[PDB]
Design a protein around this motif. Structure first.
Motif, PDB file in Angstrom:
ATOM      1  N   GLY A  61     -20.338  45.107 -15.551  1.00 25.22           N
ATOM      2  CA  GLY A  61     -20.187  46.322 -14.773  1.00 25.22           C
ATOM      3  C   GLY A  61     -19.797  47.524 -15.607  1.00 25.22           C
ATOM      4  O   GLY A  61     -20.238  48.639 -15.333  1.00 25.22           O
ATOM      5  N   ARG A  62     -18.947  47.323 -16.621  1.00 26.64           N
ATOM      6  CA  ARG A  62     -18.504  48.468 -17.413  1.00 26.64           C
ATOM      7  C   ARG A  62     -19.660  49.076 -18.198  1.00 26.64           C
ATOM      8  O   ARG A  62     -19.704  50.291 -18.402  1.00 26.64           O
ATOM      9  N   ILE A  63     -20.616  48.247 -18.620  1.00 32.01           N
ATOM     10  CA  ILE A  63     -21.800  48.747 -19.311  1.00 32.01           C
ATOM     11  C   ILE A  63     -22.709  49.490 -18.338  1.00 32.01           C
ATOM     12  O   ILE A  63     -23.181  50.598 -18.627  1.00 32.01           O
ATOM     13  N   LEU A  64     -22.960  48.898 -17.165  1.00 26.95           N
ATOM     14  CA  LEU A  64     -23.809  49.553 -16.173  1.00 26.95           C
ATOM     15  C   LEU A  64     -23.183  50.855 -15.679  1.00 26.95           C
ATOM     16  O   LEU A  64     -23.888  51.855 -15.490  1.00 26.95           O
ATOM     17  N   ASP A  65     -21.859  50.858 -15.462  1.00 23.20           N
ATOM     18  CA  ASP A  65     -21.167  52.060 -15.006  1.00 23.20           C
ATOM     19  C   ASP A  65     -21.337  53.204 -15.995  1.00 23.20           C
ATOM     20  O   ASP A  65     -21.648  54.338 -15.605  1.00 23.20           O
ATOM     21  N   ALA A  66     -21.099  52.930 -17.283  1.00 19.69           N
ATOM     22  CA  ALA A  66     -21.201  53.975 -18.295  1.00 19.69           C
ATOM     23  C   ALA A  66     -22.609  54.533 -18.383  1.00 19.69           C
ATOM     24  O   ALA A  66     -22.788  55.717 -18.679  1.00 19.69           O
ATOM     25  N   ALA A  67     -23.617  53.701 -18.123  1.00 23.17           N
ATOM     26  CA  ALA A  67     -25.006  54.121 -18.217  1.00 23.17           C
ATOM     27  C   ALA A  67     -25.456  54.979 -17.044  1.00 23.17           C
ATOM     28  O   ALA A  67     -26.535  55.567 -17.118  1.00 23.17           O
ATOM     29  N   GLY A  68     -24.682  55.069 -15.972  1.00 32.85           N
ATOM     30  CA  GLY A  68     -25.131  55.768 -14.786  1.00 32.85           C
ATOM     31  C   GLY A  68     -25.733  54.878 -13.723  1.00 32.85           C
ATOM     32  O   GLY A  68     -26.518  55.359 -12.901  1.00 32.85           O
ATOM     33  N   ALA A  69     -25.373  53.596 -13.704  1.00 33.10           N
ATOM     34  CA  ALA A  69     -25.903  52.627 -12.755  1.00 33.10           C
ATOM     35  C   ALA A  69     -24.748  51.819 -12.164  1.00 33.10           C
ATOM     36  O   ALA A  69     -24.681  50.595 -12.285  1.00 33.10           O
ATOM     37  N   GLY A  70     -23.818  52.520 -11.520  1.00 27.94           N
ATOM     38  CA  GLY A  70     -22.751  51.846 -10.814  1.00 27.94           C
ATOM     39  C   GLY A  70     -23.264  51.083  -9.606  1.00 27.94           C
ATOM     40  O   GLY A  70     -24.426  51.178  -9.205  1.00 27.94           O
ATOM     41  N   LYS A  71     -22.345  50.337  -8.995  1.00 26.42           N
ATOM     42  CA  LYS A  71     -22.690  49.456  -7.883  1.00 26.42           C
ATOM     43  C   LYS A  71     -23.341  50.221  -6.729  1.00 26.42           C
ATOM     44  O   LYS A  71     -24.396  49.820  -6.219  1.00 26.42           O
ATOM     45  N   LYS A  72     -22.718  51.319  -6.288  1.00 21.97           N
ATOM     46  CA  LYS A  72     -23.271  52.079  -5.171  1.00 21.97           C
ATOM     47  C   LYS A  72     -24.625  52.673  -5.523  1.00 21.97           C
ATOM     48  O   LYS A  72     -25.544  52.689  -4.691  1.00 21.97           O
ATOM     49  N   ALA A  73     -24.771  53.169  -6.753  1.00 21.07           N
ATOM     50  CA  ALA A  73     -26.028  53.786  -7.150  1.00 21.07           C
ATOM     51  C   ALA A  73     -27.154  52.761  -7.186  1.00 21.07           C
ATOM     52  O   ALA A  73     -28.282  53.052  -6.768  1.00 21.07           O
ATOM     53  N   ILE A  74     -26.868  51.560  -7.697  1.00 19.05           N
ATOM     54  CA  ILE A  74     -27.864  50.493  -7.705  1.00 19.05           C
ATOM     55  C   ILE A  74     -28.297  50.156  -6.284  1.00 19.05           C
ATOM     56  O   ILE A  74     -29.491  50.014  -5.998  1.00 19.05           O
ATOM     57  N   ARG A  75     -27.336  50.023  -5.370  1.00 20.78           N
ATOM     58  CA  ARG A  75     -27.680  49.695  -3.991  1.00 20.78           C
ATOM     59  C   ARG A  75     -28.594  50.750  -3.380  1.00 20.78           C
ATOM     60  O   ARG A  75     -29.587  50.418  -2.718  1.00 20.78           O
ATOM     61  N   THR A  76     -28.264  52.031  -3.576  1.00 21.53           N
ATOM     62  CA  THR A  76     -29.071  53.099  -2.999  1.00 21.53           C
ATOM     63  C   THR A  76     -30.474  53.113  -3.593  1.00 21.53           C
ATOM     64  O   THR A  76     -31.456  53.395  -2.893  1.00 21.53           O
ATOM     65  N   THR A  77     -30.591  52.801  -4.883  1.00 17.85           N
ATOM     66  CA  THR A  77     -31.891  52.828  -5.534  1.00 17.85           C
ATOM     67  C   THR A  77     -32.750  51.663  -5.068  1.00 17.85           C
ATOM     68  O   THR A  77     -33.943  51.833  -4.783  1.00 17.85           O
TER      69      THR A  77
END
Length: 142
Positions: A120-136
């Motif tokens: 998660g810390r890698i995805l968060d830093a990249a601009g792909a947090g949990k909420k953003a992934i769900r919306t996409t």
């Protein structure tokens, strides 16, 4: 405890995860292995989510995190999920049920990766947090 059928793609993601952990001589299957596998192919579902979000590329960083898992000498012939992996799999099942999906699918694994802090810390830093992934994913499922 539900034992749903899995899509062939979901089963193959897990087979590739197990093959990765074995090739690295690691002691367990970790969410980091599954995340790398999901981001390995440039046109994978997870890669296309990152593309749509304009997120930074996470493949190399996930590979580094895989290579930070100790090389065991001797390593197990059949590494099993560790407790972090179990939590990811339990969350994937929750996501499957919440979406009303009959089969366990790659989408559900992707929605569960943030249960691992190390992924998660890698995805968060990249601009792909949990909420953003769900919306996409919701847009991509249309």
């Amino acid at each position: 405890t539900q034992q749903p059928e899995w899509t062939q793609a979901a089963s193959d993601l897990m087979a590739r995860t197990a093959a990765l952990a074995r090739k690295k001589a690691n002691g367990y299957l970790d969410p980091v292995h599954l995340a790398y596998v999901m981001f390995e192919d440039e046109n994978s579902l997870a890669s296309r989510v990152v593309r749509k979000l304009g997120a930074a590329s996470v493949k190399d960083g996930l590979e580094a995190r895989v290579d930070a898992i100790p090389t065991q000498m001797p390593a197990p012939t059949q590494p099993r999920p560790n407790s972090d992996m179990m939590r990811v799999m339990n969350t994937a099942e929750q996501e499957r049920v919440a979406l009303g999906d009959t089969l366990m699918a790659a989408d559900h694994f992707l929605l569960a990766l943030h249960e691992s802090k190390e992924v998660g810390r890698i995805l968060d830093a990249a601009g792909a947090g949990k909420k953003a992934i769900r919306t996409t994913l919701l847009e991509m499922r249309k």
